[PDB]
């Protein structure tokens, strides 16, 4: 619980520089195995725009759409595109609870006055806690955006899950 509100207040904090809005989330054992959760180090997020590239690049286009030229000296055209791919990812917060738990009951052991319309009893085996930050540069949110999870192990491997932003905000955006 104690991790989502930090980036909530932090995306409220840095709303002058970047125009970001939070998305707090919890993930079950269906996403990843427990040995993939007990050693996991950090999470990354990316906002890939609808008919575009990302939101970390230049606004209109960049020079890195060239053919790869089948060589080694310009295999990436230099490490500046490597620095660009390091720039387009940002780091989110992270919490791991490696005990089986009831989510409504876990929030009820905290002071969270949960009021559900139905007792949806969700019972998973461990609780990772993170916050994806998807953004909109204009104050109007396009429903064709794409959010990109990134989960990296201390070994270095990763499994990029990703999803569009239409089934995410088809209801709560309309619930405002």
């Amino acid at each position: 619980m104690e991790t989502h509100l930090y980036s909530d207040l932090a995306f409220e904090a840095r709303f002058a520089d970047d125009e970001q809005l939070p998305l707090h989330l919890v993930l079950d054992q269906e996403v990843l195995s427990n040995e993939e959760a007990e050693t996991l180090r950090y999470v990354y997020y990316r906002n890939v725009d609808s008919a575009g590239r990302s939101t970390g690049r230049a606004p209109g286009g960049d020079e890195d759409d060239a053919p790869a030229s089948d060589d080694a000296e310009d295999a990436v055209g230099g490490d500046r595109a490597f620095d660009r791919e390091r720039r387009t990812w940002q780091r989110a917060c992270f919490r791991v609870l490696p005990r089986p738990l009831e989510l409504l009951d876990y929030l009820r052991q905290s002071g969270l006055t949960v009021t559900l319309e139905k007792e949806q009893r969700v019972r998973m085996f461990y609780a990772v806690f993170t916050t994806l930050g998807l953004r909109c540069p204009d104050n109007r949110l396009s429903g064709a955006q794409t959010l990109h999870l990134r989960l990296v192990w201390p070994d270095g491997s990763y499994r990029d899950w990703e999803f569009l932003a239409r089934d995410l905000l088809r209801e709560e955006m309309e619930a405002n």
Partner: protein
């Protein structure tokens, strides 16, 4: 009285527990929605266009299609090299072979192995794990420095004696192993190759010098890739097909966004200098009280 913002946030509680999925329908994940978050007080709209979704699915098609159009360009290069040599392929791999055996069957088995390998293409394959060390941070500088070091002048005796001294007969390849008869395509494996100095051919081994013995068996074929974009299709009998994997039909940023090699960020229990032996992992587990 002055009530803090965290008190109202804690006494707020989540409105409702939503749960969504991904594009591939593989991972569901549960999303909360707090009432006293600042997401409500922003007064934002939602314009879900249809052609924006069309172009978003086009970009998603490109992002999935990176490695698969790479594999189909690989297969085009196989057929192109098999045509341009007229089908008289050379032997590049050290293996004792016979002559009193009908090679009519092994060509049909190699074609069937090619078809079964193309049936089981995957993101865990040869060319992607060969490209990931090339996609690294200092791989371009190491490659051009190896290019400058492989091309040196004649060793003069002046720099031979009193100058500074001079400084790799083993290579770490990647391989895809297709088992044609039992129909078990083994996706991606490490292998270590060398020049067997009795002749001018290659020898493949495991991490313990195991001398990988599939090439004797007529039931299997293998694909070899090296970190210098080399392509070795091997059927039994030691005869090989050698070519270069192409990348002209791929965007640079597609290769960057799909399978970029990662460079580390600092955390707890990690040395500030790099290239050292590390301590134990964090490993916050469900075996211990959190101390």
């Amino acid at each position: 009285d002055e009530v803090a913002r965290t008190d109202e946030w804690k006494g707020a509680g989540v409105s409702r527990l939503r749960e969504v999925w991904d594009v591939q329908h593989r991972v569901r994940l549960r999303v909360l929605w707090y009432v006293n978050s600042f997401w409500r007080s922003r007064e934002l709209s939602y314009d879900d266009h249809e052609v924006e979704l069309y172009r978003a699915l086009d970009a998603y098609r490109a992002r999935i299609a990176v490695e698969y159009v790479l594999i189909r360009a690989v297969r085009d290069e196989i057929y192109a090299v098999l045509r341009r040599d007229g089908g008289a392929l050379p032997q590049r791999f050290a293996c004792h072979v016979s002559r009193n055996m009908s090679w009519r069957v092994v060509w049909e088995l190699c074609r069937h192995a090619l078809a079964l390998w193309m049936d089981w293409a995957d993101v865990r394959s040869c060319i992607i794990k060969a490209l990931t060390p090339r996609l690294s941070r200092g791989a371009a500088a190491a490659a051009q420095r190896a290019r400058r070091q492989r091309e040196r002048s004649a060793p003069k005796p002046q720099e031979l004696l009193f100058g500074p001294r001079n400084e790799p007969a083993e290579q770490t390849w990647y391989a895809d192993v297709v088992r044609c008869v039992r129909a078990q395509v083994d996706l991606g494996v490490e292998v270590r190759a060398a020049r067997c100095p009795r002749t001018g051919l290659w020898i493949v081994r495991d991490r313990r010098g195991r001398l990988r013995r599939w090439l004797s068996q007529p039931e299997v074929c293998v694909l070899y890739v090296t970190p210098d974009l080399d392509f070795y299709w091997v059927l039994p009998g030691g005869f090989a097909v050698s070519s270069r994997v192409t990348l002209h039909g791929l965007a640079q940023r597609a290769l960057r966004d799909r399978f970029q090699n990662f460079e580390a960020v600092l955390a707890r229990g990690m040395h500030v200098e790099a290239g050292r032996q590390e301590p134990e992992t964090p490993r916050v587990s469900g075996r211990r009280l959190p101390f």
